[PDB]
Amino acid sequence: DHCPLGPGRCCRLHTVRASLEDLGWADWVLSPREVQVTMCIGACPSQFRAANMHAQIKTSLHRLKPDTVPAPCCVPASYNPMVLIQKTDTGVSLQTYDDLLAKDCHCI
Amino acid sequence: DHCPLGPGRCCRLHTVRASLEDLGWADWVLSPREVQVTMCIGACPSQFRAANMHAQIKTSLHRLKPDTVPAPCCVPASYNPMVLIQKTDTGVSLQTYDDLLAKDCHCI
């Protein structure tokens, strides 16, 4: 799957660095203080990583009715789990969270 | 889950009517000649049908870095199968297709 533009300018995994205060987590989360958020970002042109036939249909109809039908969007096909330490009402916990970080990307 | 604007102006299932020629299917597909494509369309504002915590993070970071991080997108949470009749190399078939029509929607 080759990107038209770029490559790397189409839907793919990016890392976005975010503080706890950026995330709105600083009251509850104690660590990590900086999160390396992996996320899916980039254009979804025709036949680029189409998740399924619905995506192809959206491509076709977006071209013909662009004020009505949006293009396919770059979204996570899967996630990577992540560990956080956070404050509880009565203590502190180290907890795994499964759908925080995107692992791979496709156009849907 | 109440939409801010609308309601119905946020991410939800729409029906878009499409001809075979619209879809690029007219060479192969014989019926139906008009498809009632159910698709997920609409804004994804804060806390609106967030699929998961990744979506919330995207909301937060989109506000702070809007040229870098896109908003959550309205995408199908599930699909409805569909029957088509189409031409083959050597004949014709009636075939079920599972991920053509969106069944419900969420912001991801």
In whole angstroms, give the CA distance from residue B50 to residue B57: 10
> Are B41 and A69 contacting, i.e. CB atoms less than 8 angstroms apart?
yes
Whether residue B56 contacts residue B69, with contact meaning beta carbons closer than 8 Å, is answered with no
Question: Pick from A23, A53, A74: which is nearest to B99 by CB?
Answer: A53
What is the torsion angle, in degrees rounded to the nearest 10, for the CA atoms of residue B74, residue B80, residue B86 and residue B89? 80
C-alpha span between A42 and B5 (Å, rounded):
27
Which helix (H) or strand (E) segment holds residue B61: the answer is helix B53-64
Q: Which residues contact A11 (CB under 8 A, 6 or more apart)?
A: A40, A41, A42, A43, A44, A48, A49, A74, A105, A106, A107
Q: How many contacts (CB atoms, under 8 Å) link A and B?
A: 84
The token duo for A87 is 């404050």
Helix boundaries (H) for A1-108: 20-23, 53-64
What is the maximum alpha-carbon separation in chain B? 57
Q: Measured between alpha carbons, how far is residue B70 from residues A14, A73, B61, B74, B85 in Å?
A: 12, 10, 8, 12, 39
Task: Please say whether the dihedral angle defined by the alpha carbons of residues B40, B45, B48 and B51, taken in this order, is positive or negative.
Answer: positive
Residue type, A63: R
Chain A, 30 to 49: residues with Cβ < 8 Å from chain B are 37, 39, 41
A93 at the B interface (CB within 8 A)? no
Question: With contact defined as beta carbons under 8 Å apart, do A2 and A8 qualify?
Answer: no
User: In terms of CA atoms, which chain A residue is nearest residue B54?
Assistant: A100
CA distance B105 to B76: 4
Nearest one of A75, A24, A59 to B47, comparing CA atoms? A24
Q: Do A76 and B61 touch (CB under 8 A)?
A: no
Gap between the Cα atoms of A45 and A2, Å rounded: 11
Alpha-carbon distances, residue A105 vs A48, A72, A102 (angstroms): 11, 12, 7
Give yes or no for a contact between A1 and A48, defined as CB atoms under 8 angstroms apart: yes
Q: Is A17 on the interface with B (CB under 8 A)?
A: no
A38, A44, A58, A84: which to substitute to probe chain B, counting the most B Cβ within 10 Å? A58
Experimental method: X-ray
- Tell me if chain A has a CB within 8 Å of the CB of B70: yes
